[PDB]
Amino acid sequence: VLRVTHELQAMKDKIKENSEKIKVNKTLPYLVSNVIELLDVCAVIKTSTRQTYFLPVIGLVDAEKLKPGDLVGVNKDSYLILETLPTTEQYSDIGGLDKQIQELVEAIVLPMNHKEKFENLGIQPPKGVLMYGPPGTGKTLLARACAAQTKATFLKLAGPQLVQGDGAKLVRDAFALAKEKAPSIIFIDELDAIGT
Amino acid sequence: GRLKELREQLKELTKQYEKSENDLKALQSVGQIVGEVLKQLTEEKFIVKATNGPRYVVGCRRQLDKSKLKPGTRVALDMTTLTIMRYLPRSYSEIGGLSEQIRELREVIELPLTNPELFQRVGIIPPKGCLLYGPPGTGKTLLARAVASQLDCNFLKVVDKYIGESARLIREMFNYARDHQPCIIFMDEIDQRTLMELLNQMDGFDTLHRVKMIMATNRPDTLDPALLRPGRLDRKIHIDLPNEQARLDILKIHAGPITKHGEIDYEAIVKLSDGFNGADLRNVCTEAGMFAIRADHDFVVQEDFMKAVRKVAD
Amino acid sequence: GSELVQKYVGEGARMVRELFEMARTKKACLIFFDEIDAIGGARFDDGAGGDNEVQRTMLELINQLDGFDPRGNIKVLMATNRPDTLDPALMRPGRL
Amino acid sequence: CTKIINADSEDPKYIINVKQFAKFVVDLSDQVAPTDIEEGMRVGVDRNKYQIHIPLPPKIDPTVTMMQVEEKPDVTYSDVGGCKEQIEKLREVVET
Amino acid sequence: CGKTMLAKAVAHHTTAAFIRVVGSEFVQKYLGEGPRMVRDVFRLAKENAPAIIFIDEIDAIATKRFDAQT
Numbered sequence: 001v002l003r004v005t006h007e008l009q010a011m012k013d014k015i016k017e018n019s020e021k022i023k024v025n026k027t028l029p030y031l032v033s034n035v036i037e038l039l040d041v042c043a044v045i046k047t048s049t050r051q052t053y054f055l056p057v058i059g060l061v062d063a064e065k066l067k068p069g070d071l072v073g074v075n076k077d078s079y080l081i082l083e084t085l086p087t088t089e090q091y092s093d094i095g096g097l098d099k100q101i102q103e104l105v106e107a108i109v110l111p112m113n114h115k116e117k118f119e120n121l122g123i124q125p126p127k128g129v130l131m132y133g134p135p136g137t138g139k140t141l142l143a144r145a146c147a148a149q150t151k152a153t154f155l156k157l158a159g160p161q162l163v164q165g166d167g168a169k170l171v172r173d174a175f176a177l178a179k180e181k182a183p184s185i186i187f188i189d190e191l192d193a194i195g196t
Numbered sequence: 197g198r199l200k201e202l203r204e205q206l207k208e209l210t211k212q213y214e215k216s217e218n219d220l221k222a223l224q225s226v227g228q229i230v231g232e233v234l235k236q237l238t239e240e241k242f243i244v245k246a247t248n249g250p251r252y253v254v255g256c257r258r259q260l261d262k263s264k265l266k267p268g269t270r271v272a273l274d275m276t277t278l279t280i281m282r283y284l285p286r287s288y289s290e291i292g293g294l295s296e297q298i299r300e301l302r303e304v305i306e307l308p309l310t311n312p313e314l315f316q317r318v319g320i321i322p323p324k325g326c327l328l329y330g331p332p333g334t335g336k337t338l339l340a341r342a343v344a345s346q347l348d349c350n351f352l353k354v355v356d357k358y359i360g361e362s363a364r365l366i367r368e369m370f371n372y373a374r375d376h377q378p379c380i381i382f383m384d385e386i387d388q389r390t391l392m393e394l395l396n397q398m399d400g401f402d403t404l405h406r407v408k409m410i411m412a413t414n415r416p417d418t419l420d421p422a423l424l425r426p427g428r429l430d431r432k433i434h435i436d437l438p439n440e441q442a443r444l445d446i447l448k449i450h451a452g453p454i455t456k457h458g459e460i461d462y463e464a465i466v467k468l469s470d471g472f473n474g475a476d477l478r479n480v481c482t483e484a485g486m487f488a489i490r491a492d493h494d495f496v497v498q499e500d501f502m503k504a505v506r507k508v509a510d
Numbered sequence: 511g512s513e514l515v516q517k518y519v520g521e522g523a524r525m526v527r528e529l530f531e532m533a534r535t536k537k538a539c540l541i542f543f544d545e546i547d548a549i550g551g552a553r554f555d556d557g558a559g560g561d562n563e564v565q566r567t568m569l570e571l572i573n574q575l576d577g578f579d580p581r582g583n584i585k586v587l588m589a590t591n592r593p594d595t596l597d598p599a600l601m602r603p604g605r606l
Numbered sequence: 607c608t609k610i611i612n613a614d615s616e617d618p619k620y621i622i623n624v625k626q627f628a629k630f631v632v633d634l635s636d637q638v639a640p641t642d643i644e645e646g647m648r649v650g651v652d653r654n655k656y657q658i659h660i661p662l663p664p665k666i667d668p669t670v671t672m673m674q675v676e677e678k679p680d681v682t683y684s685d686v687g688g689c690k691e692q693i694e695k696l697r698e699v700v701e702t
Numbered sequence: 703c704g705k706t707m708l709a710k711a712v713a714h715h716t717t718a719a720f721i722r723v724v725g726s727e728f729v730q731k732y733l734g735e736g737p738r739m740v741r742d743v744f745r746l747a748k749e750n751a752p753a754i755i756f757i758d759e760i761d762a763i764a765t766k767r768f769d770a771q772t
């Protein structure tokens with residue numbers, strides 16, 4: 001009969017702890033940010049104020065699901081982690097580049113269509129297609145047509161929009177969004193703007 | 197039976213309560229600000245800087261082992277007294293005929309890597325590196341990572357100066373390289389007073405750790421007479437001219453990891469297109485595989501290679 | 511053109527985007543750019559790259575002007591004394 | 607003033623960030639209807655109370671607003687001369 | 703014919719704060735670091751003791767003026 005007593009005791013420590021645990025988030029200095037990294041005898045958190053803090057106590061929540069880099073609920077003043085928190089054209093409208101069209105197809109959709117043959121032959125299709133040439137030699141149009149025909153999710157990227165660690169975080173967020181969906185078409189325009 | 201669940205229940209009743217104590221105890225640490233030991237002002241106090249930028253003077257708490265807290269050491273300080281706490285630092289022959297490669301290169305790369313006693317008794321400083329030159333690609337792009345295979349150790353690929361960061365980074369990674377004596381630094385595609393200054397790191401700046409820093413790359417258009425002088429650059433190895441039989445061997449090597457009928461007239465294929473380059477033969481194999489992918493042929497038919505051979509010949 | 515360039519990196523692109531949004535909200539709007547050579551009328555982009563801010567601002571401008579889905583009701587006029595200095599990207603028809 | 611960047615079911619738990627200091631997980635102020643709170647628009651939060659007290663209208667960026675001419679100079683084509691062809695070409699691209 | 707080695711020997715068997723650090727610096731942003739260095743060395747010189755400097759390959763900086771407009 002002492003078993004229910006201990007389990008009724010559980011409605012005891014949890015209630016007070018919950019109240020305190022549900023203040024750091026609400027409090028203004030929450031500074032919810034990304035955990036720089038993790039260690040063991042512990043957390044390292046880069047607060048959204050551009051400050052690196054070291055927490056001996058790795059955090060109230062168990063450390064197994066503290067992935068290096070993720071929304072971290074830094075406490076208002078202790079800066080300890082509290083909660084993870086939630087995270088129209090056709091290929092008949094362009095000429096003079098048909099060979100490039102089939103090359104891009106066989107390199108970009110063939111993995112989408114069937115990749116078994118590539119594994120059978122022991123050669124995998126490279127990832128990432130570069131479109132370089134004079135500003136006139138159409139490639140934005142080719143990319144738009146390919147996206148329109150093939151059914152996937154477009155990911156439009158530009159040098160100016162990315163730049164503002166804002167650039168790195170935005171790039172990581174977009175790439176993660178692409179990773180989440182199995183079909184993904186990633187368009188980076190004037191890539192020379194970033195990779196200077 | 198009715199007691200078995202009670203036993204397990206007990207473990208549960210403690211488990212949730214177990215966390216309460218862990219949570220409560222964990223519910224007090226105030227964290228700390230991370231910084232670096234900028235300098236050791238005194239055995240009792242040292243100058244440090246938090247990542248935020250402000251610089252203070254702090255001291256060891258009880259025993260921070262100043263012997264190991266040399267200038268530059270991550271440490272977390274409490275934002276109530278600024279005291280030092282826990283410190284935490286945060287194919288052997290893929291080109292067919294490689295007799296040229298497995299010969300002078302080996303005898304000049306590993307020989308100075310094993311027995312420094314031999315040369316120091318001879319009184320001659322071991323050669324620090326040799327330069328390879330010849331056709332780009334096969335001799336330059338290829339067989340560059342292969343050197344690690346030949347020596348069986350991981351190497352570092354290093355791709356007047358902006359701020360001298362070339363030499364600066366070279367030296368800063370030199371200690372890491374020296375930490376692994378078998379490691380070899382391969383500053384391929386290396387390309388005033390930086391290249392010439394580049395001639396001074398090899399003499400000193402921690403170059404007594406038995407590593408052959410082979411400056412093997414045809415990329416640098418300008419050649420330094422002082423470097424090619426005996427000592428610095430012991431000797432130069434010219435990438436051998438493919439004989440169209442080494443091409444056959446390369447095709448066979450790359451034909452290995454390929455699914456095909458087997459009735460491949462490799463000699464006919466090599467005669468079809470003179471790619472001349474190991475990467476050209478790689479492209480040949482890739483194009484044959486692609487042609488096979490056309491019509492969905494798990495194998496590769498004979499004509500597919502010929503189309504691949506013809507395509508690269510263009 | 512000077513009002514576009516600012517001390518902070520990328521601010522010019524932000525203001526260009528703001529102007530584009532304001533135009534998009536409105537209907538039947540005409541825009542006139544003067545001293546276009548001022549606003550990134552070059553692409554030398556040497557190793558020093560001191561013009562990187564104006565360059566990225568101009569890239570954002572051209573991208574928002576044409577590409578993917580423009581408004582199609584934005585009549586753009588441009589007055590420059592020496593267009594020869596202008597970059598190929600803007601001078602190419604479709605944008606102008 | 608703060609900008610909302612997300613919301614969550616059950617307790618709203620907005621992830622608003624004020625200007626650039628930091629993202630704050632703040633609950634709505636007591637005296638606000640939950641309908642008004644939405645994503646990606648200006649709102650008002652107090653420092654200590656940390657809570658969204660009143661929705662705000664979108665940013666106007668007065669530089670862009672005053673950039674608009676909002677004035678018609680007293681110039682007519684009659685005064686201009688010798689550019690009849692150019693006048694017609696511009697008209698075909700702006701007015702007609 | 704024996705130069706850099708002589709300077710090296712002087713460095714090895716001296717007591718001054720020999721700071722060569724004179725990499726021929728064309729540079730593009732900081733131009734005229736002469737005073738930036740010598741003063742430091744003089745500041746070093748009085749800081750500890752008189753210093754010495756040494757370098758070759760200064761032939762580029764030699765020149766003879768000539769045009770003043772290009």
Ligand SMILES: Nc1ncnc2c1ncn2[C@@H]1O[C@H](COP(=O)(O)OP(=O)(O)OP(=O)(O)O)[C@@H](O)[C@H]1O
Pocket residue numbers: 093094095096097134135136137138139140141142604
């Ligand atoms: N071969 C072509 N067929 C059809 N339209 C073309 C072709 N080449 C260029 N274009 C025209 O150019 C545009 C296609 O994208 P665009 O030319 O802008 O991209 P690009 O030439 O690769 O370089 P950039 O995107 O930098 O301008 C459309 O206006 C399209 O009509």
